[model samples]
Target: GSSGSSGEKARGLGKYICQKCHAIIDEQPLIFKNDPYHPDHFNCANCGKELTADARELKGELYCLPCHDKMGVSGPSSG
Candidate 1:
């Protein structure tokens, strides 16, 4: 009979890593493109303004409307 042959290596591995600054979320966790984000953490990466559902992804980060617009106008995401 098997009673105590093995144990569990499993704990709360569901830890979430926020996108804006990369931190542990033991509380509120915002969802962003299938990743984690803190409400205040998800501000515009450049302007530090509030976010909108109409976000842009560049270098694996979020950008606000005008920020993203400027990024492209400055130089397209191309070589």
Candidate 2:
């Protein structure tokens, strides 16, 4: 029996919830520690900006390009 349902498809690949968007992730996800997020839901942990492929991670938190630049003056501790 071929079950082509969305739920079944997700289950087949292992589904996970995005910590940022609270949406079900069934495709390749961005992972940090144990938390997971869809590529569309992956954002800077500090400013909530959409993260690019070149985004930076600091102290276990993700930062977008501009926000990462701000960290130099504002300091990582500020976040």
- How many pairs of residues collide in each model? 0, 0
TM-score of each: 0.43, 0.41
Off by over 4 Å in 2: 1-39, 74-79
Q: What value of lDDT does candidate 1 attain over all alpha carbons? A: 0.72
Q: How accurate is candidate 2 locally (lDDT)?
A: 0.70
Minimum summed lDDT over a 10-residue window in model 2 is located at: 5-14
Off by over 4 Å in 1: 1-31, 35-41, 74-79
Residue-pair clash count for candidate 1 = 0
TM-score attained by model 1? 0.43
